Symmetry: D2
Subunit: 115 residues, 4 copies
C-alpha cells in the first residue's frame, strides 16, 4: 500500500466514514487526470488506491469531498473540498499516508512518509 488516505472528524471525535476521495496525477499538459478514487471505510481509511508499479514519481492531488460529508450531517460547511497537492519522490521513503482532520470551517492535513 504505497498510498493511504485517512480522514478524521473533529466535531464528533470519530473516523470520517464514507468520504469520497479522488486522486489525480498531473499530466504533461499540466492538467489533472483521474488516477484513483474510493470512499473511506468505517475506520476512516482508504487503502489500495494504487500499487508500487503505478505510483511513479510526479505531482498528485488528493481531493477529499468534505462538503458532502458535512451536508449529510446537517452542518453548514465552509470548503468546497480539501485538496492536498504533493510530489511523490522515489529517493526518500516510499509509503505515503495522507491524513486529514475535518471541521466545518477548518481542516488540517499532514503527511506521514515511511520506509
Amino acid at each position: 500500500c504505497p498510498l493511504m488516505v485517512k480522514v478524521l472528524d473533529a466535531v464528533r471525535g470519530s473516523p470520517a466514514i464514507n468520504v469520497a476521495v479522488h486522486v489525480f496525477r498531473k499530466a504533461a499538459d499540466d492538467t489533472w487526470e483521474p488516477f484513483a478514487s474510493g470512499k473511506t471505510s468505517e475506520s476512516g481509511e482508504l487503502h489500495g488506491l494504487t500499487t508500487e508499479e503505478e505510483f511513479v514519481e510526479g505531482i498528485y492531488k488528493v481531493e477529499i469531498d468534505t462538503k458532502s460529508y458535512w451536508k449529510a450531517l446537517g452542518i453548514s460547511p465552509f470548503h468546497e473540498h480539501a485538496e492536498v497537492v504533493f510530489t511523490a519522490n522515489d529517493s526518500g521513503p516510499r509509503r505515503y499516508t495522507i491524513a486529514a482532520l475535518l471541521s466545518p470551517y477548518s481542516y488540517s492535513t499532514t503527511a506521514v512518509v515511511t520506509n
Copy 2:
C-alpha cells in the same frame, strides 16, 4: 477589506513573511480565472486583495505558495502549496479571513467569516 489572508509559521513561531498568494474565481465556463494576488507582510497578513464591489458571489480558490516559502528557508516540504476553495457571499456580503498555519509536512487552515 472583505478578503484577508493570514499565514503563520509553526517551525519558527513567527508570521510567515513574503508568502505569495494567488486568488482565483470560478468562471461561467467552469475554469479558474485569476482574481487577485499578493504577498504577506511582516505581520503575516495580506490586505487589499479586493473590494466589496468586486468580490461578488462565486466559488473562490486561495492558493498559498508554501513550497517556495519553505525552500527559501532550506527546507524541502511535502506540499506544492496549500489551497483553500470556498463559496463566498452567497447569502450576501461577508468579511473573510483565511488563516493558515504552516509546517514542512503539514498545514492547518481555518476561516473566520463575519457579517458587517
Copy 3:
C-alpha cells in the same frame, strides 16, 4: 502587551467569544501560582493580561476553558480545557501571542513570539 491570547472557533467559523483564560506561573516551590486571568472579547482576543515589568522570566501555563465554551453552545466536548505550558523571557523580554483553534474533539495551538 507582552502576552496576548487569541481563540477561534472551527465549527462556527468565528472568533471564540467569552472564553475564560487563566494564566499561572511556576513558583520556586514548584507549584502553579495564579498570575493573570480574563475573557476573550468579541474578536476572540484577550489583551492586557500583564505588563513588561510583571512578565518576568519563568515557566507559564495558559489554561483556556474550552469545555465551558462548548457546553454553552449545546455541545459536550472531549477536553476539560486546553493547556499551553512554556518558558518565557529566558533570553530577554519577548511578545507572545498564544493562539488556539477549537473543535469539540480537537484543538490546535501555536505561538507567535516576536522581539520588540
Copy 4:
C-alpha cells in the same frame, strides 16, 4: 486496548519515535497521580497503557514530553510539553485514541472515540 496514544512529527513527516508519554488520573484531593507511562514505538504509537478493568470513568491527563523530542533533533521548541485533559465516560464509546501532531512552536491534538 482502551487507551492508545499516537504522536506524529509535522517537520519530518514521520512518526514521532521514542516520545515519553505519562498518563495521570485525577485523585479525590484534585491531585494528579501517575497512572501509566511509556515511550512511543517506531510507528509513533503507544499501546496497552491500561486495561478495560483499570480504565474507569474519571479525569485523565496525557502528558507528552515534546520538549525532549525537539531538543534531541536540535530544534529549539516552545512548549514544556503537550497535555491533553479529558473525562473518560462509559456510556459513550469505550475505545480512546489520543493523537498529537507536533511542530516546534505548535501542536494539534484530536480524540478518536469508537465502539
